[PDB]
């Protein structure tokens, strides 16, 4: 059958607090299997399903390290969006990222995802071809241009077509 | 490329001296990195930064301090210079994937 | 994670072709780069590989070939010039997009 893996990373900036609230949730098909929350006392990726209990502490460690870097990515990129949209630095804003892979019955990639939404609205999205981007407005046009120039599609495609698919199969065997 | 520039270009320090290396980039890249290369061989990561206010220990952070006060500036501080810290220091900026390097800073710490 | 450049030094005649070896060992997705470094200068990008065509064209007559099976990213130039004498570094992208460099290969063109 057709399976999918999806990650949703969201960061919400608040008034006064220099660190935005950052969350990340993973899904294998319909089921949420992993979650990281920055509000927690000891922020880390914790399993949300019994079949994820069979991953070593090394898995949870690097995954949490990555999450820590993602927070920093969001922190900086929320600020650049303020500049793009000419918004006040004393407000509340949200940036959401979603990426993942849909695999066929033959375990091969069908559709890869890499997309961002700012303040609930569209920002930029990698197309089905995994070669081009759809920018929502003029601000997202600045990102498209630099990502076209930097080869961002090729970069994301490498992950989506390999490691994403391979890990999905791994999790399916676990479940 | 004159987009990433370092200061000073050359420095001779005495053991125990506090030395600060400065890096300016005009690329508007969020990420900045400090490497050192001892014998024209492998560049090793000392410190890096995700953006203003961010400072992250690299592979070999012992003996250094870093400071990212703004987007364009990333400084590296040797608090107490030791002879083992003589080498060529390279700063880089990146918006992801490709790093862009400065021309280097030659630092000699006297034995 | 790591890249290995097996030949530390290569000597070739002016006008000969050049072939520099690089091997990587990286569990994750391999983002590979070749940089050149001339005396008193920093590393300069030659080319990179992310995905797609395994043969990539680069600056100043260089090209490279990615091979997943052999875990290699060999660099090539058909007709080297004296000005190509330098140190060549293979690199792989890691955490926070910091590059991890190979030990380098010094090229001498007689």
């Amino acid at each position: 059958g057709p399976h999918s893996m999806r990650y949703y990373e969201t960061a919400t900036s608040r008034r006064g607090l220099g660190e935005p609230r950052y969350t990340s949730v993973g899904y294998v098909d319909d089921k949420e299997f992993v979650r990281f929350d920055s509000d927690a006392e000891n922020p880390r990726y914790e399993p949300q399903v019994p079949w994820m209990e069979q991953e070593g502490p090394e898995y949870w460690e690097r995954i949490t390290q990555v999450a820590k870097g993602q927070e920093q990515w969001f922190r900086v990129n929320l600020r650049t969006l303020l500049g793009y949209y000419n918004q006040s630095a004393g407000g509340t804003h949200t940036l959401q990222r979603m990426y993942g892979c849909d695999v066929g019955s033959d375990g091969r990639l069908l559709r890869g995802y890499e997309q961002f939404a700012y303040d609930g609205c569209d920002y930029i999205a990698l197309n089905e071809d995994l070669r081009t981007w759809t920018a929502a407005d003029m601000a997202a046009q600045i990102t498209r241009r630099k990502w076209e120039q930097a080869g961002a599609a090729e970069y994301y495609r490498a992950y989506l077509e390999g490691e994403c698919v391979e890990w999905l199969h791994r999790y399916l065997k676990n479940g | 490329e004159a987009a990433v520039t370092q200061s000073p270009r050359n420095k001779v320090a005495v053991t125990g001296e506090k030395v600060t290396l400065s890096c300016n980039q005009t690329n508007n890249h969020n990420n900045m990195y400090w490497y050192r290369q001892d014998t024209g061989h492998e560049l090793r990561l000392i410190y890096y930064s995700y953006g203003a206010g961010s400072t992250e220990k690299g592979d070999i952070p012992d003996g250094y301090k870093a400071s990212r006060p703004s987007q364009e500036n990333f400084s590296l501080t040797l608090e107490s210079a030791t002879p083992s810290q003589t080498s060529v220091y390279f700063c880089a900026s990146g918006g992801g994937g490709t790093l862009y390097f400065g021309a280097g800073t030659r630092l000699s710490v006297l034995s | 994670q790591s890249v290995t450049q097996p030949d530390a030094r290569v000597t070739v005649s002016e006008g000969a072709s050049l072939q520099l070896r690089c091997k990587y060992s990286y569990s994750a997705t391999p983002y590979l780069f070749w940089y050149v470094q001339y005396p008193r200068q920093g590393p300069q990008l030659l080319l990179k590989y992310y995905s797609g065509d395994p043969v990539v064209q680069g600056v100043n007559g260089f090209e490279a070939e990615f091979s997943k099976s052999n875990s290699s990213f060999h660099l090539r130039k058909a007709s080297v010039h004296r000005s190509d004498s330098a140190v060549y570094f293979c690199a792989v992208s890691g955490f926070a997009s910091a590059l991890t460099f190979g030990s380098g290969t010094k090229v001498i063109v007689l």
Binding site: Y7, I63, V66, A67, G69, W73, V76, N77, T80, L81, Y84, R97, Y99, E114, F116, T143, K146, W147, A150, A152, Y155, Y156, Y159, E163, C164, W167 | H29, N30, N31, G95, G96, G97 | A28, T29, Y31, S93, F95, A96, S97
Partner: peptide, 9 residues
């Protein structure tokens, strides 16, 4: 294993 570090916006 998550996505590699994303490019600047």
């Amino acid at each position: 294993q998550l996505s590699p570090f994303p490019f600047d916006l």
